[PDB]
């Protein structure tokens, strides 16, 4: 039994290649082999969002604070709220982030395929970031 | 993209074979194949706890409310608080639950092996439910 | 400065005169004089709700988990979700609780008038517990 | 019954006169007369903290995410965690904020005295911001 | 006297333009000219509902199983239970469907005008469905 | 006297091991000891049916809606209609379900032996699902 | 034969340097030379505990009421219950006290060396008290 | 058979309306109907005592620790010790508490009439709290 106490994992800033705007990543877990799952808490400041991206074994988001936006390619921009659970399919191109006026925090849970949790693609333009 | 809106997943009661005392299970997600991960929010009333059990690809707990206790076989009873992240290895025999006078909720995340996410064993006696 | 550490305040059961169904009350704070504000976390099991009641200086609810229902006298039954903030006026007769199949937790904040924070009235019938 | 739905109140940035570092204020409620209580959710980025200040009728903090620091004048710098409840007395000079490496969010609840919730004083120096 | 024996009319799936979620339509009758009335049994899975729509000569619902929700545009969401009779006025924009966690079946009876019994409008958003 | 009100028992999905196709289970009652009887409403979509199975103390089916099929091992496939009552003897291997083009709902009443109410066997093949 | 009748020895409050929280000391005996043993009854309110300390010839605790916690530096926190006997070795750094929500009383028996029965050390932090 | 284990019943504080000074109440049992009896352990700090009060079906006190005082209206103040058993008749006005320099714990056993176990009256004044 390994316990990582609250406060023991340092926060980090969202890399510019992965996010538009100011994002904070709070690591939560990375399961050891042979388990595949990993998780992090991601807080988007107002107006911030991921680039477009895919996950090789899909991704589950559990919104935990605030009010955010998310979209898959070809779909509508949806508003997501604390307690909502979002599922993105393997290889489904999508983004998520804060709404323009409110921050959002979600717990992002995904299984790694050969250690790889994500494939990063182009940023979400100001023209795409609207609803 | 699938959104399971808050309040769209009914609460359920913890089966007597899986728990001592009163427990509520709030499902969150069961990822479709080829993904294997599932998650649920589990609320333990004071004094309530799981039976001893194992998970075939381990388990991650993220405490979200209250103050609980947990223990692996042969180890000390540890207190777990909101924001704490607990990892149980594959095959590691353990229990978790509320502290004696305070409820606890955690998010339990585990990957399934051949559809199975848990192996239930004997209950945690009052003598074992003690630091 | 006083810190009441998590797990240091015992859970309690909701009295039968104050609630229909099973409810747990987790005290959070009762400010000392000259301050008048108090707060508690209240968890309603599915189908559980307060009796009809009023607060002498009003009440604020901040939903923190699950999906619940609330109603003021003469009004419609409204659903309240995590992150929602509800205000009941002084003397406004109301109830709140879980939805029929999902639990709900809220933080209830109210100022006391002459030490009193609530006036309890009749229970919410099954007929009234309906949108 | 007034409901402010999650996402309906825009976030704001912590004024420089009130905070060192980057802080976000999410308003929650301001009770109408004759009630005095007000509340906001305050998220401190790593290293950020309030200036020294007092509240005329005291203040209650409920930590809801992350891991922060707080101190009253003449006291030790304490680490506070989600679920902890902090009470500052009327007129007690104090500060609160993130820890150096982790963000913290708290719900700050205070009663206003003649509409006034706080008296702002000098900033917390880098020499005082240590533990 | 014409009798259509139970089982002799095939079920159909609810078109995507007419419903959110999974719905089954079981035709019952369409009276020949000069009569104008038609009827169908409609079964909504949990969370499923009609698009917003109107009927040119109004509509009567008789709930026959489960527990559902219905709303006129501009009014409150109300629960409808087996044996309840619902009337929508001519041209009244409304929706009906299941509750979030329980299915509902109703018998829908409407008269046609110029050979048309319904005017389909925009879908009912997740926000509209709950509020 | 215990009343489970309409809408208070959430609908569930039929497990793939117990059913071919899409089935919804609406629980009605499970008598506490020393009573042994339990009942549920089961709705089969067109073409859906149970696996072959037995019940240790027999089973009564009361058809409540639609039109379905049922068969015991070595017998013919029979069509059943609302108001028909079907009895399967203890240990009698059988299946029931919808017809290919119409849904069917039945009330299934069975007594438990050693807490078990059913013994699940092989699925009903497409070749077997014919009249 | 010297008898000190119950009630004849006044209670005292536990000094701030020796305890965190509210503690009452009820002296029982201090044997005259050449005997070395002394004893006292100590009642800890919920959450109260000794500072870290050592005893030069060890110490025996006999729990007489309530439910408490104790820890040797470097070991696990263990619960001690009425009738339990605890032994701390000479020079063993430890603390004892109440559990977080229940008081505890123990009888503390220790022998003096050079007229001293205890060596007081630093206080037990909130982090140490729980972990 | 129900066992409430040591440490499972949280300690409470004596309300100011029921006691002068600092008192702790440790609940032991409240028999369910048709039984009427309830019991609690009450610990009075030095100088603390109940208000004057009565019990509708009388009260038995079993002193379990320390040395205290007790008096019925019109009687003398008596000293009571561990193992002493005190009976107050129905409707007899009395008080009990610690002595001025020693704490006292008693087990208070009383039967409820109309769910009420006590009728609280005026506080015991400093002039009355003397022997
Ligand atoms: C890669 N990670 C988890 C740190 C951030 C991506 C989260 C998301 O997909 O929204
Ligand atoms: C399997 N699940 C999530 C339903 C219950 C397991 C709870 C736990 O492992 O602590
Ligand atoms: C008074 N309190 C907080 C213990 C219960 C009130 C719950 C509510 O008003 O919804
Ligand atoms: C004034 N307010 C509530 C917006 C921020 C101060 C919060 C605090 O005292 O830590
Ligand atoms: C279009 N129709 C009549 C077959 C189904 C619409 C049912 C309803 O209005 O609730
Ligand atoms: C086992 N139960 C009641 C959940 C479903 C069985 C339905 C049937 O036997 O036809
Ligand atoms: C110092 N003394 C003996 C009066 C009290 C210390 C009790 C303890 O070591 O737990
Ligand atoms: C009412 N109760 C049992 C909580 C305290 C009364 C103590 C006493 O009567 O002396
Ligand atoms: Br929904
Ligand atoms: Br504590
Ligand atoms: Br929406
Ligand atoms: Br036939
Ligand atoms: Br600490
Ligand atoms: Br005497
Ligand atoms: Mn993603
Ligand atoms: Mn587990
Ligand atoms: Mn209220
Ligand atoms: Mn402050
Ligand atoms: Mn309609
Ligand atoms: Mn069957
Ligand atoms: Mn010691
Ligand atoms: Mn008494």
Query: What is the DSSP code string of chain C?
Result: -EEE-TT-S--EEPPTTTEES-EEEEEEEEPPTT--EEEEEEEE-TT-EEPSEE-TT-EEEEEEEE-EEEEETTS--EEE-TT-EEEE-TT--EEEEE-SSS-EEEEEEEE-BTTB--EE-----TTTS--
Q: Which helix (H) or strand (E) holds E127?
A: helix E126-130
Contacts of D114 (CB under 8 A, 6+ apart): none
| Rounded distance between C-alpha atoms, residue A119 and residue A17, angstroms | 12
Contacts of E101 in chain F (CB under 8 A): 10-11
Contacts of C84 in chain A (CB under 8 A): none
Q: What DSSP state is assigned to residue D43?
A: E
Residues sharing a CB contact under 8 Å with residue G1, sequence separation 6 or more, in sequence order? none
| Nearest alpha carbon, ligand 8 atom 9 | H108
Per-residue DSSP letter, E51: P
CA distances from B104 to B62, B69, B79 (A): 11, 9, 11
Q: B-contacting residues of G 33-72, CB under 8 Å?
A: 69
Which residues in chain G have their CB less than 8 angstroms from residue H7's CB?
Answer: 66-67, 79, 81, 99, 102
Residues B12 and H67: their CA atoms lie apart, in Å, by 51
Q: Output the six-digit token pair for C48.
A: 């559980």
**DSSP reduced 3-state for E126:** helix
B50, two tokens: 């799981």
How far are the Cα atoms of A42, C7, D61, D103 from residue C41, in angstroms, in the given order?
A: 26, 13, 14, 24
Phi/psi for E104 (5° steps) reads -145, 140
| Placement of tokens 């010790």 in the chain | H81
Element (H, E) at E128: helix E126-130
- Give the closest residue (by CA) to ligand 5 atom 4: E40
Burial class of residue A74 in the structure, from the number of CB atoms within 10 Å of its CB (0-12 exposed, 13-18 middle, 19+ buried): exposed
Residue from the list F11, F79, F102 with its beta carbon closest to the beta carbon of E101 = F11
- B76 contacts in chain G (CB < 8 Å): 76-77
Two tokens at F67?
């039109």
| Residues facing residue C2 across a β-bridge | D87
C24: tokens are 């747990």
DSSP β-bridge partners for residue G104: G44, G66
With CA atoms as reference, report the closest residue to H14 among H34, H43, H36.
H43
Burial of G87 (0-12, 13-18, 19+ CB in 10 A): exposed
Q: What angle do CA C84, D63, D37 make, to 5 degrees?
A: 60
Give the pair of three-digit tokens for residue G77.
């926190």
SS3 E74: coil
> Is chain E touching chain B, with at least 3 CB–CB pairs below 8 Å?
yes
Structure token pair of residue D4: 């402010």
Contact predicate A22/A12, CB 8 Å: no
With contact defined as beta carbons under 8 Å apart, do G102 and G78 qualify?
no
- Contact between H47 and H98 under an 8 Å Cβ cutoff? The reply is yes
The residues, any chain, with a CB within 8 Å of residue A18's CB and separated by 6 or more, are: A50, A51, A53, A120
Asked whether the beta carbons of C117 and C71 are under 8 A apart, the reply is: no
Q: Nearest-CA neighbor of C95 among C66, C56, C128, C64?
A: C128
Residue C38 near residue C50, CB atoms below 8 Å:
no
Peptide bond into C101 cis (omega under 30): no
F105 interfacial to chain E (CB closer than 8 Å): yes
Helix then strand then coil, in percent of chain G rounded to 5, is 5, 45, 50
Backbone angles phi, psi at G127, to 5 degrees: -65, -45
H35: which residues sit within 8 A by CB, 6+ positions away?
A: none
Nearest residue in B to H11, CA atom: B101
Q: CA Rg, chain B, in Å?
A: 14
CB B25 within 8 A of CB B14: yes
- Is the distance from CB of A51 to CB of A18 less than 8 angstroms? yes
Interface contact A102-D65, CB threshold 8 A: no
- DSSP assignments along B20-76, one per residue: ES-EEEEEEEEPPTT--EEEEEEEE-TT-EEPSEE-TT-EEEEEEEE-EEEEETTS-
Assigned token pair, G125: 């932090």
Phi, psi of C51 (to 5 degrees): -65, 165
Q: Which residues line ligand 4 (CB under 6 A)?
A: D 25, 40, 42, 50, 59, 96, 108, 117-118
Distance of CA E114 to the CA centre of its chain: 20
| Residues measured by CB to lie within 5 Å of ligand 10, the ion | C 5, 8; G 47, 100
Residue nearest to atom 2 of ligand 5 (CA): E40
**Cβ–Cβ contacts within 10 Å for residue H75, how many?**
11
Is residue G88 a contact partner of residue G13, using CB atoms and an 8 Å limit?
Answer: no
Do D and C touch, 3+ Cβ pairs within 8 Å? The answer is yes
Q: How many helices and strands, by DSSP H and E, does chain F display?
A: 0, 13
- Contact status, residue A105 vs residue D65, Cβ threshold 8 Å: yes
Instruction: Please state, in angstroms and rounded to a whole number, the distance separating the CA atoms of residues H79 and H98.
Output: 9
Rounded-to-integer distance, Cα F56 and Cα C114, Å: 64
Tokens of D70: 């707080």
What's the burial of F87, exposed, middle or buried (CB within 10 Å: 0-12/13-18/19+)? exposed
Q: What is the Cα–Cα distance from B2 to F125, expressed in whole angstroms?
A: 32
Cα distances (angstroms) measured from residue F41 to each of A129, E81, E108: 46, 16, 22
3-class DSSP string for G47-84: CCEECCEECCCCEEEEEEEECEEEEECCCCCEEECCCC
Cα F101 from Cα F44, distance rounded (Å): 11
Q: Note the helical H segments in chain D.
A: none
Q: What is the DSSP string of chain A?
A: -EEE-TT-S--EEPPTTTEES-EEEEEEEEPPTT--EEEEEEEEPTT-EEPSEE-TT-EEEEEEEE-EEEEETTS--EEE-TT-EEEE-TT--EEEEE-SSS-EEEEEEEE-BTTB--EE-----TTTS--
Pocket of ligand 6 (CB under 6 A): F 25, 40, 42, 50, 59, 96, 108, 117-118
- At G128 the three-state DSSP class reads helix
**Which of B22, B101, B131 is the best substitution to test chain H (most H C-beta atoms within 10 A)?**
B101
In degrees and rounded to multiples of 5, residue E129 shows phi and psi of -65, -40
- Number of H helices and E strands in chain E, helices first, is 1, 13
Nearest to B62 by CA among A41, A43, C7: A41
d(CA F53, CA F61): 14
Tell me whether residues F3 and C47 touch, CB distance under 8 A: no
Q: Which domains does chain A have, with CATH numbers?
A: 12-120 (2.60.120.10)
CA angle B31, B44, F4 (to 5 degrees): 85
The span from the CA of E64 to the CA of F43, in Å, is: 14
Give B13's Cβ-side CA count (13 Å radius).
10
Among C126, C117, C127, smallest CA distance to C35 is for: C117
Residue G62, exposed/middle/buried by CB under 10 A (0-12, 13-18, 19+)? middle
C26 touches chain E (CB under 8 A): no
Q: Which helix (H) or strand (E) is G129 found in, with range?
A: helix G126-130
Q: Which residues of B touch A4 (CB under 8 A)?
A: 84-87
Of G49, G48, G70, G67, the residue nearest G59 (C-alpha): G70
Select from H131, H64, H125, H75 the least CA-distant residue to H100: H131
Experimental method: X-ray
At residue E128, φ and ψ (nearest 5 deg) are -70, -35
Long-range contacts of G12-16 (CB under 8 A, 24+ apart): G14/G42, G14/G48
**Structure tokens of F28?**
């009605």
Beta carbons within 8 Å of A83's beta carbon, 6+ residues apart: A62, A63, B5, B6, B7, C65, C66, C67, C81, C82
Resolution in A, one decimal?
A: 1.9
Q: Using CA atoms, how far apart are residues D65 and B81, in angstroms rounded to an integer?
A: 12
Farthest CA pair distance, chain E:
47
CA distance linking residue D88 with residue D52, whole number of Å: 12
CB pairs under 8 A between C and D: 125
Q: Are D107 and D64 in contact (CB under 8 A)?
A: yes
Are the CB atoms for B80 and B96 separated by under 8 Å?
yes
What chains are in contact with G, requiring at least 3 Cβ pairs below 8 Å?
B, C, H
Using CA coordinates, name the residue in chain B closest to H10. B101
Cβ-Cβ contacts under 8 Å for D119 (sequence gap 6 or more): D53, D54, D55, D56
Of G79, G102, G130, nearest to B130 by CB-CB distance is G79
Cis peptide before C34 (omega within 30 of 0): yes
Buried b (16+ CB within 10 A) or exposed e, G18-47: ebbbbbbbbeeeeeeeeebebebbbbbbbb
3-class secondary-structure state, position H12: strand
As given in the structure block, the two tokens for residue E35 are: 């009569």
Residue A126: closest CA among A17, A21, A8: A21
Long-range contacts of E4-8 (CB under 8 A, 24+ apart): E4/E28, E4/E29, E6/F66, E6/F67, E6/F81, E6/F82, E7/F66, E7/F67, E7/F79, E7/F81, E7/F99, E7/F102
Q: Which residues contact C77 (CB under 8 A, 6 or more apart)?
A: C69, C70, C71, C129, C130, C131, E76
CB distance C104 to C44 below 8 Å: yes
CB atoms within 10 A of CB H111: 17
Question: What is the rounded CA–CA span in Å between residue H51 and residue H42?
Answer: 14
Distance B42 CA to ligand 16 centre (A): 11
Placement of tokens 């099954």 in the chain: C126
Token pair listed for H51: 């208000």
Q: How far apart are CA B51 and CA B16, in angstroms?
A: 9
CA Rg value for chain E: 14
For residue A49, what are its two tokens? 């969002």
The number of residues making up chain G comes to: 131
d(CA H9, CA H30) in angstroms, rounded, equals 12
Give the closest-approach CA distance of C84 to chain A in angstroms: 10
CA distance C32 to D89: 9
Among the partner residues A26, A45, A79, nearest to D7 by beta-carbon distance: A79
Other C-beta atoms lying within 10 Å of the C-beta of residue C108: 22
- Identify the H or E element spanning G126: helix G126-130
DSSP category for residue B113: B
CB atoms within 10 A of CB E37: 14
G130 SS3 class? helix
Site from C6, C7, C64, C82 to mutate, A interface, most A CB atoms within 10 angstroms: C82
- CA-CA distance, D96 to D20, in Å (whole number)? 11
Q: Please answer whether residues B59 and B108 qualify as being in contact, where contact means their C-beta atoms are separated by less than 8 angstroms.
A: yes
Residues of A in contact with D64 (CB under 8 A): 65
In angstroms, the CA F76 to CA F78 distance is: 6
Cα torsion F73, F74, F76, F81 to 10°: value is -30
Q: What is the DSSP letter of E47?
A: T
Which residues are H110's β-sheet partners? Answer: H38, H59
Residue G21 φ then ψ, to 5°: 85, -170
CB atoms within 10 A of CB F101: 14
Please work out whether the CB of residue B59 comes within 6 Å of at least one atom of ligand 2.
Answer: yes
In whole angstroms, give the CA distance from residue E41 to residue E66: 13
How many other β-carbons are positioned within 10 Å of the β-carbon of residue E9? 17
Could you tell me the end-to-end alpha-carbon distance of chain G, in angstroms, rounded to an integer?
46
Scanning C69-88 for CB atoms below 8 A from F yields none
* Rounded Cα gap, residues E37 and E30, in angstroms: 6
Of the bound ligands, which one is closest to the alpha carbon of residue F67?
Answer: 12
């Amino acid at each position: 039994m390994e316990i990582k106490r609250v406060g023991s994992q340092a926060s980090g800033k969202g890399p510019a290649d992965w996010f538009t705007g100011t994002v904070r990543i709070d690591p939560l877990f990375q399961a050891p082999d042979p388990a595949l799952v990993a998780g992090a808490s991601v807080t988007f400041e107002p107006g911030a969002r991921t680039a477009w991206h895919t996950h090789p074994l899909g991704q589950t988001l559990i919104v935990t604070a605030g009010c955010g936006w998310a979209q898959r390619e070809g779909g509508a921009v949806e508003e997501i709220h604390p307690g909502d659970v979002v599922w993105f399919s393997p290889g489904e191109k999508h983004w998520a982030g804060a709404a323009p006026t409110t921050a959002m925090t979600h717990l992002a849970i995904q299984e790694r395929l050969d250690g790889k949790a994500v494939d990063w693609m182009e940023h979400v333009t100001d023209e795409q970031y609207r609803r």
